[PDB]
């Protein structure tokens, strides 16, 4: 997250921190995700496509810090790693959506707590009007030039951009589809960045906090005329329902 | 490779 503010997991208790174990024991951070039901985390396919083996991955819930434990956190193995079969990429990733069925060593799913809660899915094709302010959350870079990720969770606010504005040649042209949502700061001063992928774009829709988007792609970060691009969750409900059933 | 889309990739 470029700009924005530090936070803790209490302010985004559906946030899932996803890590990969390397040949040799090393564990590195992969991406964010969102808890949509006790046993199911939703994320982005691009996060996993090069390493599709479920056994590689560790998922935490209730975690506010990148490389230290948060009191009350839960740790999970990935029982099933489901990638979208129509995924494609040339930068602008299509169908960038993934599901992780989580299961602890004791064979259990998420248990809701002050730090662990689910986020509601939107109604189909029901998104906020463009210009609406939404929030994004993640452990990604604080500056495009940084080498390190922040140790503390961050969040910021971005505004939704019309498909018409985003499809302009001087924005993204035809790289952006109707199954994607653009969002940016009016001054281009805050944005998602590398490491924020897979995490939640949450909007308040009819008084309900709703998982409107999943961090997907962008050209650089916090750059003029280059919004963040998010998978439009409201266009994937049958896919989600079928694969979680 | 230094931004969103190529996280956890073998090229990067």
Residues of chain A with CATH 2.40.10.10: 1-12+119-234, 13-118+235-245
Comparing C-alpha atoms, which of A45, A54, A134 is closest to residue A88? A45
> Is the Cβ pair A216, B10 closer than 8 Å?
no
Q: Which of A20, A30, A218 sits opposite B4 (nearest CB)?
A: A218
Query: Cα–Cα distance between A205 and A209 in angstroms, integer?
Result: 6
Query: Cα–Cα distance between A225 and A228 in angstroms, integer?
Result: 10
The CATH number corresponding to A1-12+119-234 among 2.40.10.10, 3.40.50.11540, 3.20.20.70, 2.60.40.10 equals 2.40.10.10
Transcribe A103-149 into DSSP letters. Answer: E-TTS-----BTTB---BPPPTT--PPTT-EEEEEES--SSTT-SSP
Q: Which of B4, B6, B8 sits opposite A193 (nearest CB)?
A: B4
Query: Would you say A15 and A199 are in contact if contact means Cβ atoms under 8 Å apart?
Result: yes
Phi, psi of A213 (to 5 degrees): -150, 165
Catalytic residues of A: 46, 96, 197
Residues sharing a CB contact under 8 Å with residue A160, sequence separation 6 or more, in sequence order: A127, A128, A129, A130, A131, A132, A134, A181, A182, A183, A203
Q: Which of A31, A216, A229 sits opposite B8 (nearest CB)?
A: A31
Residues of B with CB under 8 A from a CB of A: 2-10
Comparing C-alpha atoms, which of A231, A13, A39, A15 is closest to residue A122? A231
Residues of chain B with C-beta less than 8 angstroms from the C-beta of A53:
none
List the single residue in B with minimal CA-CA distance to A191.
Answer: B4
Kindly report the CATH class assigned to A13-118+235-245: mainly beta
């Amino acid at each position: 997250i470029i700009g924005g503010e530090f936070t803790t997991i209490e302010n985004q208790p559906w946030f899932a921190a996803i890590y990969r174990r390397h040949r040799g024991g090393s564990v590195t951070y992969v991406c964010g995700g969102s808890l949509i039901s006790p046993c199911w985390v939703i994320s982005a396919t691009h996060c996993f496509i090069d390493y599709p083996k479920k056994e590689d991955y560790i998922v935490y819930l209730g975690r506010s810090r990148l490389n230290s434990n948060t009191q009350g956190e839960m740790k999970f193995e990935v029982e099933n790693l489901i990638l979208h079969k129509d995924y494609s990429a040339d930068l602008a990733h299509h169908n960038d959506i993934a599901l992780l069925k989580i299961r602890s060593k004791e064979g259990r799913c998420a248990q809701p707590s002050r730090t662990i809660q689910t986020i509601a899915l939107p109604s189909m094709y029901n998104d906020p009007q463009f210009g609406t302010s939404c929030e994004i959350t993640g452990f990604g870079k604080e500056q495009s030039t940084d080498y390190l990720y922040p140790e503390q969770l961050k969040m910021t606010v971005v505004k939704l951009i019309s498909h018409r504005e985003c499809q302009q040649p001087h924005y993204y042209g035809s790289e952006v589809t109707t199954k994607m949502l653009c969002a940016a700061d009016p001054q281009w001063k805050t944005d998602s960045c590398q490491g924020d992928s897979g995490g939640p774009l949450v909007c308040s829709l009819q008084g309900r906090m709703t998982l409107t988007g999943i961090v997907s792609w962008g050209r650089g970060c916090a750059l003029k005329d280059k919004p963040g691009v998010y998978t439009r969750v409201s266009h994937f409900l049958p896919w989600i329902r079928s694969h979680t059933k | 490779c230094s931004a969103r889309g190529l996280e956890n990739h073998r090229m990067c």
